[PDB]
Amino acid sequence: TVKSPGRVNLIGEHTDYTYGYVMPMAIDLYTIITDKVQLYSEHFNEKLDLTKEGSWIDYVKGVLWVLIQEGYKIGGLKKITGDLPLGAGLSSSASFEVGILEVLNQLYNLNIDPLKKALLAKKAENEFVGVPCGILDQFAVVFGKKDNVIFLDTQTLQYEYIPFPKDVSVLVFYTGVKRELASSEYAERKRIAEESLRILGKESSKEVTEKDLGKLPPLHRKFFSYIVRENARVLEVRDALKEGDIEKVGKILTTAHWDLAENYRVSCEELDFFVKKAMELGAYGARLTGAGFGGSAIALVDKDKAKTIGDAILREYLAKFSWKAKYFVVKPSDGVG
Ligand SMILES: Nc1ncnc2c1ncn2[C@@H]1O[C@H](COP(=O)(O)OP(=O)(O)O)[C@@H](O)[C@H]1O
Ligand SMILES: OC[C@H]1O[C@H](O)[C@H](O)[C@@H](O)[C@H]1O
Ligand SMILES: [Mg+2]
């Protein structure tokens, strides 16, 4: 049996597709996997000689395809339970991918080293399932460590563990919203960023200057100016956190949210409602997490106060919107084990 965590991004959003900085954490809500390929998906109540079908099994088929293309000698396997909500923005995708991968890693004794576990799970999701996405999710879910977040330079895969204060909790709030446009909006942001680097002669958003941004056209400059600003915030969250100044960390997430919401235009009414309400109830800061357009948000909150805050925002939110929102008081966790 294998426990694969989900994940949350502390700071550094829409940054990995230009090879900038990122600071995920694995969280303590999991996927749990228990001759041919025949699996029971407990959530769905349901299913080597490798076609896409249009169903969830496609994540399973993409990992075996990716191990085989790489030459590993594996076989089949014969149940999936879990805490983790699907489609919430807590990357059940990556949890499931690398949970499957590590079952094979353990059984068929592949002794695959961690960073390849992540790069392998991400190729399965990019090439097999049709879904674009940097290394954020797979890395977090594999490299998570107990009382830590992971600073990652995604250009160079150079990472650093930074203790997250034990008397501070990350409040995860799932809005219940998954907008249908989210997918093509992600790809547009991504298309536009790729183009910007290309116009500028640059290879990463770490390199980009004030005079560089002046050379981009209106929308490209609006979108890329945000990324250059996040990169800087990540570095500032990095120092703040290593001094245990969680109030500075919190102020920075807050700035980040409104830069995301106004400029990169990937927030929505209900993420903003959560952030606004978190701040009326004493949070250090709060901010959407993941792609945007719905999904989940985080608030930094004292541990002793977290359930009272969450319950307050939940009821406040459920009076305003009809979606099935949930929240979780979450602990930074170990990656796949
Ligand atoms: N426990 C699971 N059992 C079966 N399928 C799963 C499981 N976890 C994730 N999945 C599959 O992965 C998808 C997760 O979707 P995704 O678009 O990446 O949203 P999220 O960001 O939460 O991962 C689900 O739709 C489902 O097809
Ligand atoms: O930072 C936002 C985030 O959006 C999605 O979650 C992708 O899977 C990530 O790679 C990253 O781009
Ligand atoms: Mg996902």
Q: Where are the domains of the chain?
A: 1-163, 164-337
Residue 328: its H or E element: strand 326-330
Task: Tokens for 187, please give them.
Answer: 């790809």
Experimental method: X-ray
Helix (H, G, I), strand (E, B) or coil at 329: strand
CA distance 121 to 94: 7
Q: Whose CA is nearest to atom 7 of ligand 2?
A: 133
CATH class assigned to 164-337: alpha beta
Instruction: Answer whether 193's CB lies under 8 Å from 134's CB.
Output: no
Residue located nearest, by CA, to atom 12 of ligand 1: 93
Amino acid letter, 254: T
| Residue 18 near residue 205, CB atoms below 8 Å | yes
Q: How far is CA 122 from the centre of its chain?
A: 12
The answer to whether 231 and 12 have CB atoms below 8 angstroms apart is yes
End-to-end CA distance of the chain: 9
The tokens of 101 are what?
Answer: 């991968």
Please compute Rg for the chain using Cα positions. Answer: 20
Q: Tell me, in angstroms, the distance from the centre of ligand 3 to residue 261's CA.
A: 20
CB of 141 closer than 8 Å to CB of 336: yes
Q: What are the helix (H) ranges across 70-171?
A: 92-107, 114-123, 136-143
Binding residues for ATP: 41, 87-93
Give the whole-angstrom CA distance, residue 29 versus residue 92.
10
Active-site residue flag, 259: no
Q: Whose atoms come closest to the Cα of 8: which ligand?
A: 2
Type of residue at 81: T
* Site to substitute for ligand 2 among 11, 14, 192, 260, most atoms within 8 A of C-beta: 14
- Which among 59, 114, 52, 45 has a CA at the least distance from the CA of 92? 59
User: What is the C-alpha separation between 293 and 259, in angstroms, rounded?
Assistant: 14
Q: Which CATH code for domain 1-163?
A: 3.30.230.10
Quote the tokens at residue 209: 């200057």
Tell me whether residue 29 is exposed, middle or buried, using C-beta atoms within 10 angstroms of its C-beta: 0 to 12, 13 to 18, 19 or more: buried
Amino acid at 127: E
How many Å separate Cα 90 from the centre of its chain?
6
- Tokens of residue 205, six digits: 């958003």
C-alpha distances in Å from residue 116, one per residue of 62, 121, 128, 135, 250: 15, 8, 17, 11, 33
CA 250, CA 302: separation in Å to the nearest integer? 12
- Characterize 73-110 residue by residue with b for buried, 16 or more Cβ atoms within 10 angstroms of its Cβ, and e for exposed: ebeebeebebbbbbebbbbbbbbbbbbbbbbbbeeeeb
Separation of 156 CA from ligand 3 center, angstroms? 23
Neighbours of 25 (CB within 10 A): 26
**Residue 56 to residues 41, 44, 80, 167, 168, Cα–Cα distance (Å):** 9, 9, 12, 38, 35
- Helix (H) or strand (E) segment spanning residue 58: helix 57-69
Q: Chain centroid to CA 288: how far?
A: 11
The alpha carbon of residue 306 and the mean position of all alpha carbons in its chain are separated, in whole angstroms, by 22
